Amino acid sequence: VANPEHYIKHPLQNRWALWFFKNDKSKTWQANLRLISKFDTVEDFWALYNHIQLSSNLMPGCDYSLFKDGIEPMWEDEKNKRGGRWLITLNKQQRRSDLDRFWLETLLCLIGESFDDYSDDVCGAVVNVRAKGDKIAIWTTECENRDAVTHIGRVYKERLGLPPKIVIGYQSHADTATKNRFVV
Numbered sequence: 001v002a003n004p005e006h007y008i009k010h011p012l013q014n015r016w017a018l019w020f021f022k023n024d025k026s027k028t029w030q031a032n033l034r035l036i037s038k039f040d041t042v043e044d045f046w047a048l049y050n051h052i053q054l055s056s057n058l059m060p061g062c063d064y065s066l067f068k069d070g071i072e073p074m075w076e077d078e079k080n081k082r083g084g085r086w087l088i089t090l091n092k093q094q095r096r097s098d099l100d101r102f103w104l105e106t107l108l109c110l111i112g113e114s115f116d117d118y119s120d121d122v123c124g125a126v127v128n129v130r131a132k133g134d135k136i137a138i139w140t141t142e143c144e145n146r147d148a149v150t151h152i153g154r155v156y157k158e159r160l161g162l163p164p165k166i167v168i169g170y171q172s173h174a175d176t177a178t179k180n181r182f183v184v
């Protein structure tokens, strides 16, 4: 039989779904959220990533979301309702300098399962392109899991290369939908 190394795609640990949001005042927030496609290999990730717009080129008001297959990118999902997000807030000058590199690094932290035992607490990630300042966030499934949330935040901050002068926060979705629970 042939050596699999020669011809098989490299499976990822999870199957992931990419979503797109375009702000339209004619429609509800949920109706503006649409599924693009799914992938579960390294090769299919790069084929998707290489044919879509960089976040910095999106019209203001748009989002990308990458979530594990089966989890919708909204607070109301069962695996998001009790969770929260590690938030990266960027200034207007950082759309040029950091937004796209931070986003791709965030994508790799997800599909590469970069958070060791706590990668099962990850639900997905969201980049919001906005005129007042863009945002990148990793969503985790239980805001009360102190060890999981902390270790995800610290690993995330280092992978992004942020210096200790910067401090990022973690907010539960219930607070957003109605403060930081943690900071690293």
Ligand SMILES: C[n+]1cn([C@@H]2O[C@H](COP(=O)(O)OP(=O)(O)OP(=O)(O)O)[C@@H](O)[C@H]2O)c2nc(N)[nH]c(=O)c21
Pocket (backbone or CB within 6 Å): 029, 073, 074, 075, 076, 128, 130
């Ligand atoms: C992520 N999310 C966003 N929305 C709606 O989209 C709105 C904007 O939320 P946003 O996440 O787009 O942040 P933005 O920076 O645009 O707005 P801000 O941070 O309030 O200044 C939210 O206030 C909700 O009305 C959401 N509405 C529901 N029902 N579920 C969601 O998960 C959800």
